[PDB]
């Protein structure tokens, strides 16, 4: 049964932000009208809380003591006047700056002349204290000066995070940090613990363009980093285009569904003053919001794609035997899409299916569910009352170290970590799985009795997995359950004993595969499909670069495109051959060390061309 309670973790921010509809064309009156429409539409009761003032409020001016100064013709009463107005509505207020010396209003002016000086570098503590003193509850910290100056994102945002924490401690007003560095330098590796949210890609929409489902989907794909998100820390696929001109009701729901399955922030970006009744209702759907804001804090993942473009996404919800599912159709025709219990990490026992847009139960099954999905459309379900797959349970074999952890397959697993935190404040620890990049986990107050928080981790097939915690509360056991829909395999070189690896969890098209010490991370877990693809992160295909057909052709990751250069034969002699070329996956020069490049080469008997893929 349920025997140790699950501790609720903080949800992603919900609210509205000024960028998508106004660009830098903002002032007090713009924000006030949006606040009034937000309130009139009943957004606050649905959970929407933040009113975020984005680029355009500050032209880069400072007084002689280095204090940020604003133009009171645009901001009468100064910035504490607009925070007071927002607060008078029971809402929270957000502000915006840059990590560097000059901001995006300087580097990429959009609706205003360039604003030199519009960044916080050299003033992190001063500016963070200022924002907090003015009354801001949220700050979005952009990267235009960081990118321009050559700054290191990880160390820079750490310094910024420290200043955010000091500012909030001084004023007594909590300050929510949004890291906005567009997925540059792989923020999923380092942002959890520094901030509750971090941008995973470039902008969902550029001022002057129409909302695009293509852009939406690219942002969604780029946000999927399930080991990086947990315990109040979220991947951020960007501000919503819900309700913007050109998006249909169906596209608006699909936007909500995909953000909800990720557990993404819901920061509306439409013009609230002309918002339709239908759009308001789509933003406010409480069942969809409840999935987005799930107490367990986990990120949804792809669990099936039996036919290209016909996809099932699953999310592990709070409690036991509960799942949310999105069925998504990226093809040009309506098709049936099925989700199987086995893929969701449930046993073949009865569960109840509910449609979150119909707001009605639509069937039971002990095996799965199929719905017709329109071209470009999606269906949003929960599957509840199911039976969880059998877990492993483990006790620490040394201080903060769990060893001998078992996975039937390489792939993603849900770990519930038991602990007691009988104090009034959350504590953090560093978690490292095998030799993977470490992550930070937060442990909220439990009272006197133990509770669990959950994390998603990627493990290697077998019983040699380790989970090691440093710092934070003593833990009292872990539970481990697989998500079979995420199953993959290490591709291990016979000669080297090393694994096909994409450096440091990079997702960029054209990154070349290399040998690396096997660690079972997402950047090493390859799913071989019925279409002979070798798929990484659920959405990148092992690819012979530019359909190269000769010795030395680079083997890279690339968006899956159905071509022959992304198809691979796993041969009985241990070779892996590219279909287009007939050449063998090859560890270059028969080197065996970390960083050895993988290429295509004419097949022979050599062991740098031999692999295991189980
Ligand atoms: O990514 C941000 C966008 O969200 C808005 O803040 C304008 O500046 C860009 O750099
Ligand atoms: O964990 C990864 C490892 O697999 C390799 O890609 C080098 O970078 C580390 O972050
Ligand atoms: O179509 C190929 C693609 O598969 C990748 O190899 C990049 O180059 C393109 O020409
Ligand atoms: O034999 C290896 C071959 O497999 C390829 O890696 C190129 O270098 C050669 O020395
Ligand atoms: O980017 C490279 C990566 O490909 C790996 O080989 C280690 O060195 C880094 O500089």
Tab-separated table of N, CA, C and O and ligand atoms in Angstrom, residues 501-504 506 511-516 594-597, ligand 5:
chain	number	residue	atom	x	y	z
A	501	UNK	N	28.065	8.246	-26.666
A	501	UNK	CA	27.786	9.322	-25.704
A	501	UNK	C	27.672	10.669	-26.432
A	501	UNK	O	28.467	10.963	-27.330
A	502	UNK	N	26.700	11.489	-26.045
A	502	UNK	CA	26.643	12.851	-26.567
A	502	UNK	C	27.075	13.810	-25.454
A	502	UNK	O	26.475	13.840	-24.372
A	503	UNK	N	28.150	14.552	-25.711
A	503	UNK	CA	28.863	15.272	-24.657
A	503	UNK	C	27.972	16.136	-23.752
A	503	UNK	O	27.255	17.022	-24.225
A	504	UNK	N	28.028	15.860	-22.452
A	504	UNK	CA	27.478	16.768	-21.430
A	504	UNK	C	25.994	17.094	-21.592
A	504	UNK	O	25.550	18.182	-21.213
A	506	UNK	N	24.217	17.591	-24.263
A	506	UNK	CA	23.980	18.529	-25.352
A	506	UNK	C	22.912	17.978	-26.285
A	506	UNK	O	22.888	16.773	-26.566
A	511	UNK	N	25.972	17.611	-33.137
A	511	UNK	CA	26.925	17.192	-32.107
A	511	UNK	C	27.363	15.768	-32.402
A	511	UNK	O	26.523	14.899	-32.589
A	512	UNK	N	28.671	15.531	-32.460
A	512	UNK	CA	29.174	14.209	-32.824
A	512	UNK	C	29.219	13.239	-31.634
A	512	UNK	O	29.680	13.606	-30.535
A	513	UNK	N	28.765	12.007	-31.856
A	513	UNK	CA	28.882	10.936	-30.862
A	513	UNK	C	30.343	10.600	-30.562
A	513	UNK	O	31.197	10.623	-31.461
A	514	UNK	N	30.623	10.283	-29.299
A	514	UNK	CA	31.968	9.893	-28.869
A	514	UNK	C	31.893	8.720	-27.913
A	514	UNK	O	30.835	8.443	-27.351
A	515	UNK	N	33.019	8.043	-27.687
A	515	UNK	CA	33.072	7.068	-26.605
A	515	UNK	C	33.162	7.828	-25.296
A	515	UNK	O	33.839	8.856	-25.218
A	516	UNK	N	32.480	7.319	-24.276
A	516	UNK	CA	32.662	7.838	-22.921
A	516	UNK	C	32.438	6.749	-21.883
A	516	UNK	O	31.698	5.794	-22.124
A	594	UNK	N	37.923	8.198	-23.461
A	594	UNK	CA	36.898	9.234	-23.475
A	594	UNK	C	37.180	10.249	-24.576
A	594	UNK	O	38.318	10.710	-24.712
A	595	UNK	N	36.151	10.607	-25.342
A	595	UNK	CA	36.276	11.642	-26.369
A	595	UNK	C	36.678	11.124	-27.737
A	595	UNK	O	36.859	11.912	-28.671
A	596	UNK	N	36.843	9.807	-27.861
A	596	UNK	CA	37.103	9.195	-29.162
A	596	UNK	C	35.876	9.418	-30.056
A	596	UNK	O	34.751	9.055	-29.662
A	597	UNK	N	36.083	10.012	-31.239
A	597	UNK	CA	34.961	10.316	-32.143
A	597	UNK	C	34.437	9.041	-32.817
A	597	UNK	O	35.218	8.111	-33.100
B	5	LIG	O1	33.636	19.433	-26.693
B	5	LIG	C1	34.603	18.447	-26.413
B	5	LIG	C2	33.887	17.104	-26.300
B	5	LIG	O2	33.572	16.695	-27.617
B	5	LIG	C3	34.677	16.024	-25.531
B	5	LIG	O3	35.475	15.257	-26.395
B	5	LIG	C4	35.581	16.564	-24.417
B	5	LIG	O4	36.261	17.734	-24.832
B	5	LIG	C5	35.381	18.801	-25.144
B	5	LIG	O5	36.116	19.993	-25.349
